[PDB]
Amino acid sequence: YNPEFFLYDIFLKFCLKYIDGEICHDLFLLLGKYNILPYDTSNDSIYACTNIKHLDFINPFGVAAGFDKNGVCIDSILKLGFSFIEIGTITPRGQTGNAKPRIFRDVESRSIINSCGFNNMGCDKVTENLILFRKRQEEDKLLSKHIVGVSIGKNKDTVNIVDDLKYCINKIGRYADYIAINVSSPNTPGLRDNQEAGKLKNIILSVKEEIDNLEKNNIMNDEFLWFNTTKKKPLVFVKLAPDLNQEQKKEIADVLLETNIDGMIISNTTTQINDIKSFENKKGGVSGAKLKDISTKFICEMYNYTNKQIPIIASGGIFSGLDALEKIEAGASVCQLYSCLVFNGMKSAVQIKRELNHLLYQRGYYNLKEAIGRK
Template sequence: MMYNLLRPLLFLLDAETAHTLTLDTLDLLKKTGLLPDRTISCTPVHIMGLDFPNPVGLAAGLDKNGAHIDALAALGFGFIEVGTVTPRPQAGNPKPRLFRLPQAGAIINRMGFNNDGVDRLVEHVQASGYRGILGINIGKNADTPLENAVDDYLACFRKAYPHASYVTVNISSPNTQQLRQLQNESELEQLLGALKVEQARLSDLHGRYTPLAVKIAPDLDLGQITAIASLLLKHRMDAVIATNTTISRNGVEHVPHGNEKGGLSGAPLTERSTAVIHQLASHLQRAIPIIGAGGIMSARDAQSKIEAGASLVQLYSGLIYRGPALVSEVTSQLCTRPDHAG
């Protein structure tokens, strides 16, 4: 209810300013004891060798530097994913770069992996009191040539490995030039092969296995989805996240800011991301778990993703429009489902 009262005021501010203010306010409430931890009784979901206390997570992008983990965890998430983080700090794209489209329940962003670098993120993770499941989402620096992208992912993977419950490989953001080319069969073959070799080495080095997930775009045709699914199976990846934001403008063509460049998320993405989950699930046959993301604005949207084949879901844009109540709503709905554990 408090968020419903504050949202009109937040929406008067520039979107990125409101984002920062909201996170800082959550931190303050947590530190002063005014943000109690929310918990909902739920049968744990076991995937990737991990026990998720509930199937509702926070998607990457909201907390790029892992600076607000404790406050966000208090909202009742079953897991938190931070990043996307790159080997070196980078400013991202010029502002303004984040736009709300309230008429469509959507957001367009062209942030461009703005972050303080993987070393700083690790410092924040180490300082956090959170002991739940933490995903770290990794990418490449914008000025790293595509032919050297594997080196950036390996550099981030090595540093994130001992501090993450799982690591997500982001090859699907539309806001870093050429990044989505890494979803092409030959490039993806090379990247996944290198990461799996490194995963085995790091597992021996640290005495623990950190799973690897891959986050894909919603703008893939059936042939591309089939090829990606085959590579995920070949390289025995631990999970796939479907999906990132879309470059489509279906449903927002005539809405203010609808033609801004960047990735579109929120309600216009709901059906497409669910369709990708369904297509992936038909190829993977539960051999690799799917984490559903993209346009979850209600409990029903989350349930549709579970029914399409996802084992877990992640929220982002829905939080901007619905606030923390969405976490409780979705968790309550999924935790009452007898098949929610997938």
């Protein structure tokens, strides 16, 4: 491995015991901004590359939304060894989010709870940050072929979700490889109710429509319209919460096929977790190890209910290569990490890529794509 990763695990050990969780996170981000994290400069195995339609991932691990909300250190997080990152969730206008403290960690169970409430700098600032990233990407050998998706959402006092989505799309869409529609945060009331079938359908179609209209105004070639990685219009995903009834699920499955959505992220955080003692005090959505089983089962169902037609992005509870293969066997094409980063540290992507590779060999798969959906 590397010593650089070593010191940071030590600093991280310290910070987990004594420092407030949001502060640790900001600290991590500040280190990224300053470009003093370690680099994974290794070639990823050609046997674990993956794709979602025409969107190609050099490796199957990315970082989930809510980690770099404002795109302040995309380079540095990608350079840890991840194939992609999802920035945001963003909203049209900058927002403080809910009252601090709003993030707590339980180390022993490797779980997190949060009630952030979409704290972010807003679309215009985040768009400016993405633009600067995209300019660096053109000059930096390590960033080529790396994917950046943008998670989009609504301001908390916004009545019309769709108007919020549309505005985001027209601002930042050109710079995104994909757009994740966040209708699943349990920290802005209601929002989660937008997963009801009628509103969701309308939402997907308006998203898809605004993206298409990006292409129509401009005089330039596509090479110049899409200032992203794929050089094409961003794909459209929707991230779902796991706190839904079986009937609801089958009904959401239906609308995804009907609207021909490019993919689904399963899943967002849960509020259905009761047995974490340090979290009785606390409010919001739950991440980490305890979410793994629920999230896995949710992938199975949706893959089934969509007839293996809608590419799945998996989240969360993913810590090991084994955790990772479970998701893939259940039907995920690609995996996002969040908590693992928090508890396992900067080495997370290097560690997990090796384990997925070593485990793909013991199960005698020829490559990753062959494992998808092999229950």
